[PDB]
Amino acid sequence: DTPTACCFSYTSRQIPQNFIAAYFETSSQCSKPGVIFLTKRSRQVCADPSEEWVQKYVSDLEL
Template sequence: MKVTSLALVTLLLAALWMEAHSFSFDRKHNTCCYANNFVRKPISPQLIRSDRPTDHRCSRQAVIVVLRRGKEVCVDPSEEWFKTYKENQKNFLKKLGLSV
């Protein structure tokens, strides 16, 4: 009975450990943003290569902006400059006839 219980607890702990580490397995796409690493100043649109939202499992929802040289920074999506950037980007794609 003790061996069975020990084996069950070991399997449970292993499953929990794997679940905890699978979240950060692909760090490039599962990055979360924390209060102290947000960019507060507006970023010039010419410097932005792309952007993506943080993973839904992150405690703070944000947008990760990839700059021209590959640097990634965190941005609050409710910032007025970022809303303007996204709206301009959407309008530009509409002009090109691409779906948004």
């Protein structure tokens, strides 16, 4: 029964895409929808999943 990550604030500047290593979407248990980007420096950053660059970034990570 470990913790579960969630978001409450979203970054507001598009992050240069090349800094970004991976992503995951936050569990639906969270009071809000969330995308957590993991930078290539093991930093974790919340982003607004309803935002365009955010889903662009997510899509590329896969395709």
